[PDB]
Amino acid sequence: IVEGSDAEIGMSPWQVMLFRKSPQELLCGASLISDRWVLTAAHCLLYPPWDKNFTENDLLVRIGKHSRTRYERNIEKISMLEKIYIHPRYNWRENLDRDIALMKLKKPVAFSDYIHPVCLPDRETAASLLQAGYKGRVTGWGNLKETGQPSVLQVVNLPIVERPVCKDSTRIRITDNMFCAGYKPDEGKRGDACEGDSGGPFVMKSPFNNRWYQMGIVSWGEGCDRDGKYGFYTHVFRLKKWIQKVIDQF
C-alpha cells in the first residue's frame, strides 16, 4: 500500500497472508470468506511469465495477523492448504482476465476477535455499492513505494473509477470481470496498492445492514501510485457463480 496508514487492531479480521514455506516470505494477500475457504488472485499461484506455479504444499495461510514479520503468538493462526482451484478461463497471457482463485483449508479455522469472515456480495449489494465515486478499502503488507516495506498491516481508502477513465489509462485490454480504483490526478489525495498487495481484499461497508462485503481482489497495475494510472481489481460478483459452484460441489 502506498500513501496509506497503519490499520488498527481487528480492523480487517478477514485479511489473510499467503506465506511461502521456503524461502519463508510474504507471497500475497487473501481473504477469509468462511471457516474453510480463502479467496485470492490467481496470478499469486500461477503466472508462467515469471515461472510462478505454486502447489498446495508450497504454501501456508496465516490468519489474524497485524505485524508483517513477527509470528504473533496466541493471536495469528496458520493453516495448510488442502486443494487449490484456479478459474478455468484465467487469462495470464493477455490481461489477467478472471484473476481469481479459491483455496480450501485442511481444517476449519476458529473465529475470534482478530479472525472473522467477510461477506460475499449478492446481486443487490453489488448493484447498489459498485458505483464510480463510492469508496472502498484495500489492505496489505505490500511495498510502500514503487521499486521500503511496512511493519504493520497498511490500509487505504480509494474511490471506484468510471469504466471509460479506466480504459483510457492503459493499452491493456480490460474486461467486464475487472474494475479500477484510485484518485484522479486533480483530486489532490492519492494512494494505491502495490507489489506485495496482490490477492488482497477490496471491501465496502454496506450502509443497509452494516456488514462488510468483498467487492474486489487486488489484481494488477502499472507502477504504483503513478498519476493518471489506476489499480485494477477482479470483479468478485461477476465470478460469484463459479465461486458458489466450487464450494457446493467440493
Binding site: 514455506k21 519463508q24 516470505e25 501456508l60 514479520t69 513477527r70 509470528y71 496458520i78 495448510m80
Partner: peptide
Amino acid sequence: YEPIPEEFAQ
C-alpha cells in the same frame, strides 16, 4: 521474517 513454528511446515 520471524521463523514459523516447525509443526506447520509439514
